[PDB]
Amino acid sequence: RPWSEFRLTPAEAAAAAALAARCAQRYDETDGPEFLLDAPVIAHELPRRLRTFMARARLDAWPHALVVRGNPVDDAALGSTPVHWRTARTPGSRPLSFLLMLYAGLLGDVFGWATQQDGRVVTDVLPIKGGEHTLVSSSSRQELGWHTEDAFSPYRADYVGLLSLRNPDGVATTLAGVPLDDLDERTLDVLFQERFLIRPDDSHLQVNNSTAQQGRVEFEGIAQAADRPEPVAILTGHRAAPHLRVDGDFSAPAEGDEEAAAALGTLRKLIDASLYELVLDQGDVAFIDNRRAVHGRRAFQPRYDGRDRWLKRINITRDLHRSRKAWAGDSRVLGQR
Amino acid sequence: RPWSEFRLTPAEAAAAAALAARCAQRYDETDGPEFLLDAPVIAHELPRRLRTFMARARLDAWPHALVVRGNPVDDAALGSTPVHWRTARTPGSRPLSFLLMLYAGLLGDVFGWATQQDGRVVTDVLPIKGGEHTLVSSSSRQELGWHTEDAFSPYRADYVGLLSLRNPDGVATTLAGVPLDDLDERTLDVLFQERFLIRPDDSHLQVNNSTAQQGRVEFEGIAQAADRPEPVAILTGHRAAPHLRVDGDFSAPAEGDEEAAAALGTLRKLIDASLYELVLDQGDVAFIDNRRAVHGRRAFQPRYDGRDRWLKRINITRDLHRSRKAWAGDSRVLGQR
Ligand SMILES: NC(=[NH2+])NCCC[C@H](N)C(=O)O
Ligand SMILES: NC(=[NH2+])NCCC[C@H](N)C(=O)O
Ligand SMILES: O=C(O)CCC(=O)O[O-]
Ligand SMILES: O=C(O)CCC(=O)O[O-]
Numbered sequence A, B: 001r002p003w004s005e006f007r008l009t010p011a012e013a014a015a016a017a018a019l020a021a022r023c024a025q026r027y028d029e030t031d032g033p034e035f036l037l038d039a040p041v042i043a044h045e046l047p048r049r050l051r052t053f054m055a056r057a058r059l060d061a062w063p064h065a066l067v068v069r070g071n072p073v074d075d076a077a078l079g080s081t082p083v084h085w086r087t088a089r090t091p092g093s094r095p096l097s098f099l100l101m102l103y104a105g106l107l108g109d110v111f112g113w114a115t116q117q118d119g120r121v122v123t124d125v126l127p128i129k130g131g132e133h134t135l136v137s138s139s140s141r142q143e144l145g146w147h148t149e150d151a152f153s154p155y156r157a158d159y160v161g162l163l164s165l166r167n168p169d170g171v172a173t174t175l176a177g178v179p180l181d182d183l184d185e186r187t188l189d190v191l192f193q194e195r196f197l198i199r200p201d202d203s204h205l206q207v208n209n210s211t212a213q214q215g216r217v218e219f220e221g222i223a224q225a226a227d228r229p230e231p232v233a234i235l236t237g238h239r240a241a242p243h244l245r246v247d248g249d250f251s252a253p254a255e256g257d258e259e260a261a262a263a264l265g266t267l268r269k270l271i272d273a274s275l276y277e278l279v280l281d282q283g284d285v286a287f288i289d290n291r292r293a294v295h296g297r298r299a300f301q302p303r304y305d306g307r308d309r310w311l312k313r314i315n316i317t318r319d320l321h322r323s324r325k326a327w328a329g330d331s332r333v334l335g336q337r
């Protein structure tokens, strides 16, 4: 398979769960300054085989994601799936939020966005009634199209972590790598050139944040990125293993550039054709390599009966200092005027 | 002080030394594939207070370096300072080489250069007889001028680790940050523009590697960088806390660009004026932030009596994948055609 996979033994999973539960006892919140600082060191106490996997798999050249299977989740303890991300920090989900951050700490520095889900670091992916046909994570009936997370931003995550709290109907996350076996060298050349526009996605809009947050200055920066996007490349780095920056619904060619458009058009077709499925069953965690792969989510019919699919999510950078220009008073919540 | 400092307790230092000694027993070499992979996980067994320091201090906004004092070194066990880096992997220095790599593993991914000290990851800084007045690390009588490590390369280290095996006469390492208190905004603007040339330093030349290594294709890339340097910026990122890329002896303005030259001239003067000293006593380890600070070494009179100043050195990147274009058959030894 095109991702790297690790299955916790029941004992290893229990030990990891126990560690997260201890953290949940000792800290007030996952996004508090204290746990943000301590989590990377506390993570050193996770099962050694898992730490070895995370240290090695991160350095392999090929995988689109690192997938860890077998974290126990008790639906009775977890409670009902929240109706909105706003109210999704439920006591039942609290230990698993801590668990996700512990795993994340092995791969890098976690962070959030001032303009997304009220500046939370641990965020939620769940269907919101009335928002089935939107372009955001809370959609359902409309497929979430493939994308690089926060493609518009130079400070976008290196890895995106997704922990499945529940997924009773096995709804697939989608993935695709760079279609290197089919991109001709001229098209490739053009994709490496700064000839494309990527605008911020709808999750960064004021309407998709709580009314209280609407005043934030960081929404100014989002508006600038939407109104006056600077041309950037889709592919960067090594021609034989390029890094990818694209969003199927928020990318465009530079104005009037038909050669760039043709390259983007070809890329779309090749990515659509090579898109594959990864089902995150309850307790599965994936860390998607946001430079090697784009990802999305298959269309599904939401339940709204309290047992909808529900993920916890977190952004990870290999280097927090790369985004210091966007440190919005805090280094862990990013945005700009 | 402008760096972050940690002093090991005798017990902590002994525990760290013991761990490195165990590694030296169990692995054949520091640069072998096995220890390179395992070191970051083995480092989780270092004293917890040190791990906390390394995790937190790396994320602070201000320090030019992370300095760890108090690693014991026994000169009798260490043996005489080698006459050349070639023969510097002495049994007496072996545990301390492992120790350096363990500390390095807490901060990132270590790597070396195909074109420097025969592609070694752990390298040596010691005076070489006949080479006192050179621009390389083995100089002495001539001051090693301030520089960003491997400034010419986009794959240059994020952190440079220096472990002092001996330094009986307290020879100072030099450091300077961006002179933000004195750079006017016009000069600053120009330094942020791609109007400067940075060429590879002499340590990357064939003459400063073993005759056997002379055939390496990676020297081709060095020659290209020396002959046809592409214009780059000196300052990048946040205007209020810029990252720095400059080498006092290998930087130049773009051809005929007198405004760029004036900005570089001003920068030189301000850096010379703000340069300060850090003395790495025997057993001290510094991890210099290669983006916030330039560094060098004061002129000193070499002894050549077997007790010359001697450091082990290692390059660290926050993300090995950023250099995949330069993975010279191995991800840990960098270079290009
Ligand atoms: N093509 C897209 N739908 N892009 C936006 C992806 C979803 C976005 N990351 C969110 O949290 O809502
Ligand atoms: N300005 C300079 N002297 N630059 C080169 C610095 C020394 C170089 N890093 C070496 O290992 O030899
Ligand atoms: O629901 C999923 O599996 C993915 C959600 C997502 O890509 O959010 O940006
Ligand atoms: O000798 C020192 O302290 C520094 C050596 C160095 O900057 O090597 O590039």
Ligand SMILES: [Fe+2]
Pocket (backbone or CB within 6 Å): A147, A148, A149, A295, A296
């Ligand atoms: Fe996404």
Ligand SMILES: [Fe+2]
Pocket (backbone or CB within 6 Å): B147, B148, B149, B295, B296
């Ligand atoms: Fe140096």
